[PDB]
Design a protein around this ligand. Structure first.
Ligand SMILES: COc1cc(C[C@H]2COC[C@@H]2Cc2ccc(O)c(OC)c2)ccc1O
Ligand SMILES: COc1cc(C[C@H]2COC[C@@H]2Cc2ccc(O)c(OC)c2)ccc1O
Ligand SMILES: [Ca+2]
Ligand SMILES: [Ca+2]
Lengths: 172, 172
């Protein structure tokens, strides 16, 4: 059961979820993605769109992470091209103070010393788009990602406060 | 013709080279490395060991870059394990404002927005060690890298001011 990561011309995400950070024990997300599109946003996360946000996307077909928080501000590409039309497994995990990115079962990137142990305790996760204008990225891209998403798990179901309407979704 | 990246117990680099930055047109370095060692420094670069330095090393067998300058400060792992005893081609290039890392002919990491266009115009490159105590790294490691280095080219020969004695080197 797959859903489109893009719905029409607009750049708005296809879904948003909110979580209570005081109740998250599983700090990882995993999904499968398929696309012929070399550029776009896969998902976005934040507790504050000005001071504490994260983006996983594609640029030139390869994963790109942009991160801006108290401890780190970076724009990093890594891993192989994923715009080949094959399904790819992706996992993003927080391990200690590091963010790990695994692609097709292989760790391709570890951003060390990017997270601390004060913080707004509501985390939003947006799929297929950002929760601010693309102009506010560290390095702008065009967020629309013409691809499909399946087998997707986001953080801890036990900590979810809200989830956007699922009837917005468009089957693949 | 290969040389050891480690010489005895000391952590000192096996070689140091200095370059005139006003005369560097080729902002890349390339070499082959072979090792069974999961941790250590491959090479170090700086114009200032306090304010503008760079380290390429291994941690848990995989490439790690530490960088500290005016524009960026980061600790990032990427790429596959290289401590398998096979020769591996490595290239580090500055492209625009980004540092690229290629391993065995594949781009594995692109640190974007990490270099500017004021700066001390002497760059040092040290092989097999740092030019400050490992304690001053963003994330300490044990610098000794029991491996061998060959087919190595460093920046622009036309810009080199000085190079350490080559009779210090130990054949592999
Ligand atoms: C690395 O820094 C950030 C990463 C993110 C992105 C988050 C969503 O998928 C990766 C991350 C998971 C995660 C879950 C609970 C957390 O408490 C947490 O804390 C950082 C991180 C958002 C804001 C940041 O500051
Ligand atoms: C990214 O930032 C740095 C990278 C480095 C490491 C340098 C040596 O191998 C990669 C780099 C090549 C290079 C050559 C000439 C340059 O003028 C230059 O400028 C940055 C960079 C040292 C200091 C930094 O600030
Ligand atoms: Ca696109
Ligand atoms: Ca070692």
């Amino acid at each position: 059961p797959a859903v489109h990561l893009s719905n029409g011309p607009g750049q708005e995400p296809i879904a948003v979820m909110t979580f209570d950070l005081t109740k998250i024990t599983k700090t990882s997300s995993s999904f499968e993605v398929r696309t012929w599109d070399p550029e776009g946003v896969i998902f976005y996360g934040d507790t504050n769109p000005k001071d504490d946000w994260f983006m996983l996307g594609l640029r030139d077909g390869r994963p790109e992470i942009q991160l801006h928080n108290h401890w780190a501000q970076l724009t990093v590409g890594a891993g192989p091209r994923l715009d080949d039309g094959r399904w790819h497994q992706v996992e993003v995990k927080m391990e200690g103070d590091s963010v790990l990115l695994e692609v097709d079962g292989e760790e391709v990137l570890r951003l060390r010393q990017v997270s601390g142990p004060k913080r707004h305790p509501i985390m939003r996760i947006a799929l297929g788009g950002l929760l601010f204008p693309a102009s506010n990225l560290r390095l702008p891209l065009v967020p629309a990602l013409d691809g499909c998403l399946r087998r997707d798990s986001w953080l801890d179901k036990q900590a979810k406060i809200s989830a956007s309407a699922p009837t917005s979704l468009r089957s693949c």
